[PDB]
Design a binder for this molecule. Structure first.
Ligand SMILES: [Mg+2]
Ligand SMILES: [Mg+2]
Ligand SMILES: [Mg+2]
Ligand SMILES: [Mg+2]
Ligand SMILES: [Mg+2]
Ligand SMILES: [Mg+2]
Ligand SMILES: [Mg+2]
Ligand SMILES: [Mg+2]
Ligand SMILES: [Mg+2]
Ligand SMILES: [Mg+2]
Ligand SMILES: [Mg+2]
Ligand SMILES: [Mg+2]
Ligand SMILES: [Mg+2]
Ligand SMILES: [Mg+2]
Ligand SMILES: [Mg+2]
Ligand SMILES: [Mg+2]
Ligand SMILES: [Mg+2]
Ligand SMILES: [Mg+2]
Ligand SMILES: [Mg+2]
Ligand SMILES: [Mg+2]
Ligand SMILES: [Mg+2]
Ligand SMILES: [Mg+2]
Ligand SMILES: [Mg+2]
Ligand SMILES: [Mg+2]
Ligand SMILES: [Mg+2]
Ligand SMILES: [Mg+2]
Ligand SMILES: [Mg+2]
Lengths: 131, 111, 115, 205, 120
RNA sequence: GUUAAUGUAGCUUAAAUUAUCAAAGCAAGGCACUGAAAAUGCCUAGAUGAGCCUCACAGCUCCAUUAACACCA
RNA sequence: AGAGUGUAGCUUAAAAGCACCCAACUUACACUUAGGAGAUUCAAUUGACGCUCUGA
RNA sequence: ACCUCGGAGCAGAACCCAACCUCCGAGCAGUACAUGCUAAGACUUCACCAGUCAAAGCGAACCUCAAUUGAUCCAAUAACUUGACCAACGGAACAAGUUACCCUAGGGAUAACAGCGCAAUCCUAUUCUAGAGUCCAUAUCAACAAUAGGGUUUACGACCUCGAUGUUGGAUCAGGACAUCCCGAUGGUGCAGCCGCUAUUAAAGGUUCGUUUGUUCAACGAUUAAAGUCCUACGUGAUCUGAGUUCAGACCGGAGUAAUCCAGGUCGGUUUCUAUCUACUUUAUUCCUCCCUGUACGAAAGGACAAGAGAAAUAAGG
RNA sequence: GUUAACCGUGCAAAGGUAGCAUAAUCACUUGUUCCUUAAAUAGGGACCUGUAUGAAUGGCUCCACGAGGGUUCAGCUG
RNA sequence: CCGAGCCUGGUGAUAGCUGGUUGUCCAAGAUAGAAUCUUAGUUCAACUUUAAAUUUGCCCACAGAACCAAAUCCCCUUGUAAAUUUAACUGUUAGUCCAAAGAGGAACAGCUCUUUGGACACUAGGAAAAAACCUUGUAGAGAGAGUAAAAAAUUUAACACCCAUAGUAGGCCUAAAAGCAGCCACCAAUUAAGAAAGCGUUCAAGCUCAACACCAAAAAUCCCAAACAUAUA
C-alpha cells in the first residue's frame, strides 16, 4: 500500500517559506515600511548607530529588511563667511523597518531617542526613494 | 497540423526491484531512480545514475530517518537555514540488515 | 485511499500561519543538535534503531574556581599544561567508577559474567 | 454596487496551452461555493454543465432589467469563463492535431449556487424573475431561498431515514453485492446512486 | 477501470438484529461452512474464475465444506456473489468411523449421522 | 482554408548587430519672384505581446500583407 | 494585616542546556571563530528574608 | 507535416501503456588526464543488438550534466586508433519525374456514386419576455438562450458492395409524406371593403406553356384557382436519351528542362441483353359570366360574400 | 507621389512594342452597352484588369473553300 | 487483342497477392510488444503445443514502497495443484462490441486511440429477430425432476365571493403629468380603501386588486400479435 499511515512524513516546503501600507483596521496602523535615516557629519558614529539600531530590532524581533546607504554629500565651507574653503562632508545611511505595532511605536522610538549619540539626526518617513 | 513533436521516449523501468523484507545478495540493485526517492541507509551504496545497491548479503528494510545533509552540500544547507526551530526533515532510507556473520574461527591443525 | 497517522505526525506543532515570525534556524549546527535528539525518540513509525539496536561540596568548589581564577595570571589563557596524574587520582576517586561501568558494559562483561 | 458586473468573455491573459476536456469538472456534487455568503436568494444548480459568455449575458441583462437597484443587490458565485474549448473549423477530416481555441467556458457542478441575491424583500418577490433565469440555464436549476435550501436539505435527509426498502445504493455498491461493481463506476461509490453523468436526480435516495 | 474490489470491514460486523433474523450467535460460532455455487463463473473476472477452482466449486449446486478460519473467509469474500454459505450444524455429533458409511447432508444443513429410509 | 515569405524615417533601398541615402518636409542661403542645383540640421518604438541573452537582431506569440495551393473519382 | 511562593533571562534542567555580551570578519545582519559574564533569600521538610498579590 | 534520442502530462500511488495527442528540449559544452587495469552481484526501455550500475582486488590519490547520438562491412593507420545530417537516424555501397496509351495481381482491409450511422451545419415546433410593432412582449416579426424533433443540404465515419450496386438533368409512368401552393372547413387579426397576414383541420382532386443554360436552379415572357415542399438506390437507363461528367484525338492560356499536367475552358467521341422466378396486366372537379348591385362596407377610391340562374374547360368513361 | 502625360526610386539581359481582345485564352463573368427575341447564360458589333493576350510558340485583316463548331431569315414537314 | 508482333526455347519465370488443399476418431488451443523501403509480409519476444526434469506456483497479512481516486506491487499463513527449468517446434503477430478510467472529435458516430475487465469468433437458454447484454459451460441415451435468466410502468392546469367615498389638481419637478413620464416624501379625514399592485389617461375619468363589511407532438409501400382492469403467490 503505497501512501501509508506515515504519508507526508517528509514535507520540506510548507515549513519553509517559498518564492505599501499596514492596513490592520481599528488597532490601526502597525507601522509598515519606514525608512529611518541616520545622518552625520562623521562616518564612524553614523555607522555605529545603525549598528545599534539593527541589533536592537532583532533583539525585539521586529523585522528589518535593508541597511543600505544614501551616498555622500559634497559641500565645502559654504562661502557665506578672504573667503573660506574647507570640505566638510555628510554621511547618511538608511535603516529600514517593516514590523511595528501601535503599542511598541512610541516606546521603540524612546530607545532610539535615549541612546542617540553626538551630532546625528534621525528622520522617520514612508517609502518613495531610490539610490 | 500538430506542431508538437518529440515525446516518443519509452518508459525508464525505474522503481523498487527488491521490495521490503526480501533477501538480497551483496551487489543486487535494490532500486533505480532519478530525483532521490529513497536514500541509502546501512550497507546500501549509490551509483552514478543514483541507483541503490546492496553492499552486504542480507535482508532489505525501509525506514524513515532524520535528514542531515553534508555541510559542503550548498544546495541544501540553505534548505536547513530557512526552517523554523522545531523542524526536522525526515527523508526515507533503505537499509540492509546483514544475515550472515562475516566468518567463524575453525580448527585447521593440531600443532 | 488515505489512512490517518498512528501517533503524532512531526512538524505539526510548528505549522503556524505566522511563518515569517518564527524563530528560524540560521546555522547548520543548531539543526544538527536538534536532529540528533529526534533519533533517540520513541518514533511510532519505523526506525533504523529497531532493526539495528553536597552542600559543603559545592561550597568548597565555589571558592576553588575563584581562587584558581587568579593564579592563572588570565595570563595562562591568552597556554596551561594541566598535570594529568593528579587529575587521574581525582578521577579515580570521584568519576572513575561511573565511567568504569561503561567499559565493563561495552566490552560485554556483564552479559557474560552475570547475565 | 448593487447590480451584476460585466463578465467579459476571454480573460486578458490568454490561455496558450490547450488543455484536455476533463469532464470530471461537471460530474457529481460540488465542493465549491454551495453556501450563502452575504445574501439570501440564489439559483441552485441541479445538474452540471458549462456556461458560455452567452449564458452570462443572459443572466446579467435579465436580472438588471427586473431588479430594483435600491432594494436589491446581486453577486456572482461563478468566475469568468476560464476553461478554453477547442473547436476545429468545420469541413475537415479527423487528424491534424488539436484545433484552435474558440471560446471559453466555466464549469458548474451540481449543487453549486450560481447567482446570489439579497435585499429588502421576501422570496416570492425574487422568485419570479430568478426562475426564468434558472429555466434558461443549460442545466436544470432552481430559484432557492436561504430557507428553502435548508427545507430541501431537511426533506432530502428525512427521505434517507424513512425508506422502507432495505436496499439502498450505498449498502449494495460498497459491499459489492451482485458483483454489481462490474457495471458501476468508481465514482458510484462516493457520489451515491444519485448522480448519473451530468444529471442529478433529486428524487432518488 | 474495473479493478479487484475490496470490501470495508464494516460490512462484516453483525448487528444484534442480524442475530435475530439468522440463527447464529457471536459467542460459540459455527466451525464449518456449507458452500454451494449458485451462479456461473462466466462473465466474471479471471480472479473469481480462479478462486472458485481453489475452493473446489466447479460443479454448481454441489455442496462443499470449508473451515471457518479467517484465511478461507478471505477467499469467500471475493466470490460471495456466486455462492451460498450455510453453517454446518450437526444435530448428533461428528460421524464416527463406524458411522461414516451412511450419512446425508439434509439441506437446512443438518449432517444426520444415522440416515435410515424409514418413516418416523 | 493551408503552407511560403515580408515586415521601417513622409515615401524607399539598405546596413547580418550599434540603423544609412534619397526624394518628403523644415528653414537659411546666387537680389525682379519661383523650379533646378548644392549645403546644416530635421524624418526610423526597425509591424506585435512576452525577456534566456542583448535584440531589426533570435526562436516563439502574433497582427496585417503578399505569392503558392485549394486535388483524383 | 491575609496570601502565593522563590534555580542568573527561561526552563514536567539537576549547579545543566539554551538565551545573552565584546571583539575579528560582513554595507550591516546572519553564520562562524576567539573570548567574557553569571544563580539555588538565609538558618535547623521545617523555621525565618525577597517579590508579586488581597488590605486600610 | 513528420521519421532518432530525452523531460512532463494523458498514465493521480510497482512497472508498462497509444495518438498527424498536449507541451518542452538534445545532435553539446565545461573540468579533468589513474576518463588506469581488473572483477563478485545485479538492472535493462517489454525481443535481440545496444545500453546501465558495482563491492572487492591491483595500482594510485590523499567527473558535472537529461538527451548530447550510429551496427556490420569496408577504408585511413607501423601501432594505438579514426572515419556518414548512413537524420528515411537497427543504417540497401551508389538510382528521379511521368502515364487520361497504360497493363497485371489484388482490395470493399481503401476512396468516388448509393445505402447506413451521427446531426456539427441545416430545417421545424415549443419554452422565455429583451427588443420591434406610435402606445402595447404574444395581430405580426423576434435577440441572448433553453428543451424536443426531422433526416431534404454541406460535412464527418469507412459497416455491406471493386470475381461491377451503371451516373447527372430530361422523357415515360408515377407510389407516398403533409411541415398545404390551389380548392374546402374554422380561430385570431394592427380583419372597414377588395385584398392580405397567421393559426387549427383536410392529402379526395389539381399543380401551365415558353426563350437562354447540359442543367436541376435561377433569370425572363405570357399565364393560371395555384404554377407547393420533399422522399422514393440524389424514384425509374434488362423502358429510352448521352447534351453534361469521366478514356484514347486535339487546340488555347498556365505549371514543368521535357514527358506531361490543370474541379480552367472548347470541338469530337460504340449505351449489350432472346425474361427462369417474384410481382403485375379493366372498379368527377375547377374557373368564368349573369344576377343579387353597383349592395354590405368606407364617407370616398374601390367593392364582396352566402341564395339563384347560365356557360365552359380539364379529367374519367364511351 | 501630382485617373494620372510627369517626377521620385529600386531592379533587369530586356522590361509586352505593333496589333488584337471578356476570345476555343485561369477565375471574378450570365462583365458592360447596342442589335437580335414577346422573353437571349446563345449569337453578332463595340468598350478593355488581357495583372494568366501578343508577333515563323507567329500577330492581324481578307477572296475562295469545309460531311469542321456555333447563329439566323424563308420555306417545308408527324 | 501492337506504348512495341508472333512462335519455340530459357520456363514448372516469379508472385509478401487470390483461389484451392481429399478417411474416421479424440485431446490441448485466443493473439502484451519490438524492429523492419515495414505496417497485405517476416524475425525475435509473448502466448499456445508436445516430451521431459525438478521444486514450489497461484490465492495472499501484519509490516513496507516521494517528494515536488478505484486499485496495483510485495507477502507468510491458508485454500488448492500446479509452477519454473531443459529439449523440439510450429501457428497467431490486418480484431470486434459492452461496462469502467481517459485522450482526439461536436462532452457526434455501429467514430478513432490506449488501459483494466468481460463476452464474442464455442455449444445452450433469454432479451421478438440478434456476435459482443443477461443466464450457463466437459459433452451420451431417457416419453423423469428442480431450477437459472426471463412479460414496462405512466394521464395530468376550474376558482374566491362581495365592495370602493375623501386631503389632493401630492411638497418637488415638468406645457401637462390629479394611482400609474420621474425623484424624494408616502403622513392623513372617517370604522375602513396604497400619494396605488395589474389593465385602461397628452392631463383628466373609467375596470380590477389590496381595505372595510358579508360568511406536448411530426415523414415518406401497410397500424402492427391477439387480447384482457376483479377466485386467493
Ligand atoms: Mg512520455
Ligand atoms: Mg512508446
Ligand atoms: Mg529486457
Ligand atoms: Mg574501488
Ligand atoms: Mg528505422
Ligand atoms: Mg489526351
Ligand atoms: Mg485489373
Ligand atoms: Mg469497409
Ligand atoms: Mg458515401
Ligand atoms: Mg418597443
Ligand atoms: Mg476501424
Ligand atoms: Mg464498388
Ligand atoms: Mg457475382
Ligand atoms: Mg395539417
Ligand atoms: Mg437516380
Ligand atoms: Mg438500353
Ligand atoms: Mg433498372
Ligand atoms: Mg463528327
Ligand atoms: Mg424469385
Ligand atoms: Mg476566361
Ligand atoms: Mg436556339
Ligand atoms: Mg519575334
Ligand atoms: Mg508459382
Ligand atoms: Mg477440446
Ligand atoms: Mg505486403
Ligand atoms: Mg469501433
Ligand atoms: Mg372605478
Amino acid at each position: 500500500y503505497k501512501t501509508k499511515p506515515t504519508h507526508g512524513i517528509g514535507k520540506y516546503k510548507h515549513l519553509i517559506k517559498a518564492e505599501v501600507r499596514a492596513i490592520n483596521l481599528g488597532t490601526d496602523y502597525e507601522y509598515g515600511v519606514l525608512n529611518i535615516h541616520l545622518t552625520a557629519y562623521d562616518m564612524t558614529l553614523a555607522e555605529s548607530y545603525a549598528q545599534y539600531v539593527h541589533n536592537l530590532c532583532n533583539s525585539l524581533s521586529i523585522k528589518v529588511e535593508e541597511s543600505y546607504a544614501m551616498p555622500t554629500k559634497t559641500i565645502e565651507v559654504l562661502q557665506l563667511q578672504m573667503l573660506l574653503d574647507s570640505v566638510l562632508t555628510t554621511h547618511e545611511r538608511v535603516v529600514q523597518i517593516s514590523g511595528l505595532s501601535a503599542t511598541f511605536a512610541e516606546i521603540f522610538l524612546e530607545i532610539i531617542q535615549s541612546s542617540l549619540p553626538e551630532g546625528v539626526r534621525l528622520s522617520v518617513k514612508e517609502h518613495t526613494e531610490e539610490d | 497540423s500538430s506542431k508538437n513533436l518529440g515525446g516518443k521516449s519509452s518508459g525508464r523501468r525505474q522503481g523498487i526491484k527488491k521490495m521490503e523484507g526480501h533477501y538480497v545478495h551483496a551487489g543486487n540493485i535494490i532500486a533505480t531512480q532519478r530525483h532521490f526517492r529513497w536514500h541509502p541507509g546501512a550497507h546500501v551504496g549509490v551509483g552514478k545514475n543514483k541507483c541503490l545497491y546492496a553492499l552486504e548479503e542480507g535482508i532489505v528494510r525501509y525506514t524513515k530517518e532524520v535528514y542531515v545533509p553534508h555541510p559542503r552540500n550548498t544546495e541544501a544547507v540553505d534548505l536547513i537555514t530557512r526552517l523554523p526551530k522545531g523542524a526536522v526533515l525526515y527523508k526515507t532510507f533503505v537499509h540492509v540488515v546483514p544475515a550472515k556473520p562475516e566468518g567463524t574461527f575453525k580448527l585447521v591443525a593440531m600443532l | 485511499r488515505r489512512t490517518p497517522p498512528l501517533g503524532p505526525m512531526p512538524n505539526s506543532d510548528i505549522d503556524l500561519s505566522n511563518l515569517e515570525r518564527l524563530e528560524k534556524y540560521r546555522s547548520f549546527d543548531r539543526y544538527r543538535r536538534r536532529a540528533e535528539q529526534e533519533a533517540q525518540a520513541p518514533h511510532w513509525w519505523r526506525t533504523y534503531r529497531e532493526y539495528f539496536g553536597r552542600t559543603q561540596q559545592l561550597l568548597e568548589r565555589k571558592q576553588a574556581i575563584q581562587e584558581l581564577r587568579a593564579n592563572v595570571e588570565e595570563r595562562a589563557a591568552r597556554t596551561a599544561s594541566v598535570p594529568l596524574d593528579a587529575v587521574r587520582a581525582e578521577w579515580e576517586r570521584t568519576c572513575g567508577p561511573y565511567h568504569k561501568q561503561r567499559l565493563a558494559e561495552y566490552y560485554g562483561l556483564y552479559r557474560d559474567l552475570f547475565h | 454596487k448593487p447590480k451584476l458586473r460585466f463578465i467579459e468573455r476571454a480573460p486578458l491573459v490568454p490561455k496558450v496551452r490547450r488543455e484536455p476536456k476533463n469532464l470530471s469538472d461537471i460530474r457529481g456534487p460540488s465542493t465549491e461555493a454551495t453556501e450563502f455568503t452575504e445574501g439570501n436568494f440564489a439559483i441552485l444548480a441541479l445538474g452540471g454543465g458549462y456556461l458560455h459568455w452567452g449564458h452570462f449575458e443572459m443572466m446579467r441583462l435579465t436580472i438588471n432589467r427586473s431588479m430594483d437597484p435600491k432594494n436589491m443587490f446581486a453577486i456572482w458565485r461563478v468566475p469568468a469563463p476560464f476553461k478554453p474549448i477547442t473547436r476545429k473549423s468545420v469541413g475537415h477530416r479527423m487528424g491534424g492535431g488539436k484545433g484552435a481555441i474558440d471560446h471559453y467556458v466555466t464549469p458548474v457542478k451540481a449543487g453549486r449556487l450560481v447567482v446570489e441575491m439579497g435585499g429588502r424583500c421576501e422570496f416570492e418577490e425574487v422568485q419570479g424573475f430568478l426562475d426564468q433565469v434558472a429555466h434558461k440555464l443549460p442545466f436544470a436549476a432552481k430559484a432557492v431561498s436561504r430557507g428553502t435550501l435548508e427545507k430541501m436539505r431537511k426533506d432530502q435527509e428525512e427521505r434517507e431515514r424513512n425508506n422502507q426498502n432495505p436496499w439502498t445504493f450505498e449498502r449494495i455498491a460498497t459491499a459489492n453485492m451482485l458483483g454489481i461493481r462490474k457495471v458501476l463506476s468508481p465514482y458510484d461509490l462516493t457520489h451515491k446512486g444519485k448522480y448519473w453523468g451530468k444529471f442529478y436526480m433529486p428524487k432518488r435516495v | 477501470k474495473f479493478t479487484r474490489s475490496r470490501i470495508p470491514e464494516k460490512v462484516f460486523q453483525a448487528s444484534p438484529e442480524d442475530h435475530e433474523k439468522y440463527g447464529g450467535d457471536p459467542q460459540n460460532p459455527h466451525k464449518l461452512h456449507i458452500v454451494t455455487r449458485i451462479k456461473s463463473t462466466r462473465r466474471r473476472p479471471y480472479w473469481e474464475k480462479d478462486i472458485i477452482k481453489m475452493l473446489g466449486l466447479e460443479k454448481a449446486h454441489t455442496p462443499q465444506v470449508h473451515k471457518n478460519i479467517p484465511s478461507v473467509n478471505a477467499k469467500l469474500k471475493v466470490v460471495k456473489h456466486l455462492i451460498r454459505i450455510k453453517p454446518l450444524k450437526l444435530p448428533q455429533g461428528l460421524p464416527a468411523e463406524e458411522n461414516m458409511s451412511n450419512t446425508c447432508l439434509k439441506s437446512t444443513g443438518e449432517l444426520v449421522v444415522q440416515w435410515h429410509l424409514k418413516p418416523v
